[PDB]
Amino acid sequence: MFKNAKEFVQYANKLKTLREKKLNGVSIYVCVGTGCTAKGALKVYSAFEEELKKRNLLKVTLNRTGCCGRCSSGPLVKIMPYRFFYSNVAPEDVPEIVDRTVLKGEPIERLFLTDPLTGEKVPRIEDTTLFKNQDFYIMEAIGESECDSIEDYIARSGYESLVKALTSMTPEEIIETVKASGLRGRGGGGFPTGLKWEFTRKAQGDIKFVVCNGDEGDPGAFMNRTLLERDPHLVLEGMIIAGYAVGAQKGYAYIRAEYPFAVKMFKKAIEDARKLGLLGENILGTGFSFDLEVKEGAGAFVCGEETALLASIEGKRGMPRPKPPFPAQSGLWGKPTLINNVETYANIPRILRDGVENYRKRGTENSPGTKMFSVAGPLKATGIIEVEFGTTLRDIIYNICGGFVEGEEFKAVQIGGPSGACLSEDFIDMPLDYDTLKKADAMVGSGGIVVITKKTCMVEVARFFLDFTKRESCGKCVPCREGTMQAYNILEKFTHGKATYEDLKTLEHLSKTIKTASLCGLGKTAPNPILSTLKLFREEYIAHIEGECPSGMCTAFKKY
C-alpha cells in the first residue's frame, strides 16, 4: 500500500477478513476510556490478562476499547460471539467471568445493565432503551473497536474516505461537498466549516497549516478527549483530508498534557499512520505530502481562542489579539491556518464516505448531522451520548439519561459551561439547534451538559463560573482582567449574605461592559452566567440580598 491504492484496498480487505474471523471467535473488550479507568478498568484488564494466561487458553483475544457511553455504569466489558454487556466489573470477579461465560457462555444476570425507564435488566446494550433513544453516527461499533489499533480501524472500513478523496477527488470538489453538506463548526460557534476551508484555500500562500483544537472549552466536559481516545484515526483522517482540501503540508494537534491517555493514543495513531504510509513525504504515490505532530497543552482555558491557540503553539503565552486579520489568512507564523474542533474533523470523513442527502437525513435543514454531548450532574445514567440536531433537553435528561435519582428534582441546566447559558424548565421543550435556540438567549455550546437541581443555588453557580473566568483570564484587556474579578467579588458578597441592591445594580451594569468591551470571546461570554441567572432566577438574588437563600446552602446564615 506504500505505492498506490490497489495494495491499500488489498490490505483493507484482508484486514476485514481477519477482523471478521476474530470477531466470530471469543474475544474480550474492556472499556479503558476515562471514567471507567477511574473505576478500575485497568485492573479489570490486568485481571483478564493474568487469568487467561495462568489457565493458558488464549483462542481468546483481549482488547482495549473506547468509551461506550455508559461511563457511570462501572467498568464495561463485552464478549463478542454472544454480544453480552457487563457493567460494574470488579477486578475480583473476573475469574468468575472467565469460568462462567468465556468458556461455556452462560448469561450472568447479576452483572448486566439496568434500565432506568423500565426498571429491568437487558443482556445487550444494543437492546437497551437508552441506546435506542440515541442517534449514533460518529460513535461506531460501541464496545467492539480497538482504540490502539490502526489495523482495526482499517478493518472497519476506516481510511477509505481519504483514499477516495486523494486518488479520485480534487481539493475543489472536497471543499464543495463539505460546503453542500452544511457541516457547522462544532467548537460552539457553529460557523460553516466549508466556508472556513474555502477561506483557507483561497488565501495567498504556498505553505499552509491545519490545526486541531482538542480543548473541550468547558471545565465540566470530556466529550473531546473521549472522542480522541475512542477513534484517534477518525480525527487523523479528517485532518489529513482537510489538509489535502486546503492544500496544507503540515498539521498540528493540540491535546492538553492533562490527558495522558489522549496524548499517547494520538501519538500512537500518528506513528501507525506514518508506518503504514498514510503520512509522509508521498502518500499513496499521489504527489501529496503531509505530516502531523501533537502539541502538548500546558493548560490554559484561554488557549481555546484561535489567536491564543496559535500563540501557544508557537511557544509563547496564549495571548489573543484582535481577530482581523483572521487566522485563515495569517495564522501560524503568518501562514494561512485552518482551525477546527475535534468533532468537526471527525464528521469530515463521515460526510465524505456518505453523500450530502444521506448526511442531511439527520438533524434539521440548517444543522445537519449529530452532536456528541457529555451529560453530568445527578442522573441515573450519565456519560457520553450522541443525538441529532433536533432533540430537546427533556429527551436527553429523561429518556436518554434515565432521569434524576430518587429524591432529587430539576432546577436548571448548563449547556455550554461558563460561556454557555443557564436554562430553566421553560426552555426544556426546545429542539437543540444552532439557530432555534441561538435567538432565545441560549446556545448548544461545545457539547457539555450539567443538570442543576433544586438543592443547587444559582447565585452559587454564577459565583463558581465567575471564579473560573477570573482565574482563566489572560490579563490583557481591562474589561475582562478587572471586571471579572470585580464581578466575582460582588457575587461573593451575595454568597456571604452581605450584599445590597446597589451591588445588584453594579453587577448588572458591569456585566454589559464586560460583554461588550472585552477583546476576545472569553471576556465577552464571561458574564453569561450572571445574565442568565438574573433573567431566570432574579428572585433568588433578591432573597440573598435579604439573607434567605431559598435553596439553603450558602453557609452564611444559619442557627442563630
Binding site: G33, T34, G35, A38, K39, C71, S72, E216, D218, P219, G220, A221, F222, R225, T226, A257, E258, K295, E296, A298, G299, A300, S312, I313, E314, G315, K316, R317, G318, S374, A376, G377, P378, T382, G383, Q414, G417, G448, V450, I452, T456, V461, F464, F468, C474
Partner: protein
C-alpha cells in the same frame, strides 16, 4: 553542569516553538522548574530568562515549587463543584492546613484544583498520585488523609 536538560534541548533542537514541551519534560524530571535550571535553558536557547518565566507562570501544568510527596488533585469541574467539591477542599485544608496551589512544610502534601477528570459519575472526585477517590465527603476525605498519613508515618 547539566546533562539531562542538555539532552532534552538537543532533542528539541533549541527551538522556541518546543519551549513548552521542553519545560514539561524538565518538570517531569525535576518535579518543578528550578530557577537555576531555566537560567541554564535560557543561556542554551539564547532566550532571556524573563521570557521563560512569563511562559512558565502562564500555564497551570508548570509549578515553581516542588510537588508534594502525595500530590492531591481535586476536581473543580461543574459537576464536581455542585456535588460538594468545596467541602472536600475545606476538609483538606482543616486536615493538612493548606490551600490549592500550596505545599506543606516537609513537602508531604500538595494541592491543585483542576477541571473535569472525565469521571463526573464519581462527583466529587479526588486524585492522589493517580489514585482516584470518588463520591467523597468531608468524613471520607478526612478518613483517607488520616490513613495515608499513618501509612507514610510508618516508614518501616
Amino acid at each position: 553542569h547539566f546533562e539531562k536538560v542538555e539532552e532534552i534541548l538537543k532533542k528539541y533542537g533549541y527551538k522556541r516553538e518546543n519551549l513548552i514541551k521542553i519545560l514539561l519534560e524538565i518538570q517531569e524530571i525535576y518535579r518543578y522548574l528550578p530557577e537555576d535550571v531555566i537560567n541554564y535553558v535560557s543561556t542554551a536557547m539564547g532566550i532571556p530568562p524573563a521570557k521563560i518565566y512569563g511562559v512558565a507562570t502562564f500555564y497551570a501544568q508548570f509549578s515553581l515549587k516542588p510537588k508534594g510527596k502525595y500530590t492531591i488533585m481535586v476536581c473543580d469541574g461543574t459537576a464536581c463543584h455542585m456535588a460538594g467539591s468545596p467541602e472536600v477542599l475545606k476538609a483538606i485544608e482543616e486536615e493538612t492546613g493548606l490551600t490549592p496551589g500550596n505545599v506543606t512544610e516537609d513537602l508531604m502534601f500538595s494541592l491543585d484544583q483542576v477541571g473535569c477528570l472525565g469521571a463526573c459519575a464519581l462527583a466529587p472526585v479526588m486524585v492522589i498520585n493517580g489514585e482516584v477517590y470518588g463520591n467523597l465527603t468531608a468524613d471520607k476525605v478526612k478518613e483517607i488523609l488520616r490513613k495515608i498519613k499513618e501509612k507514610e508515618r510508618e516508614s518501616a
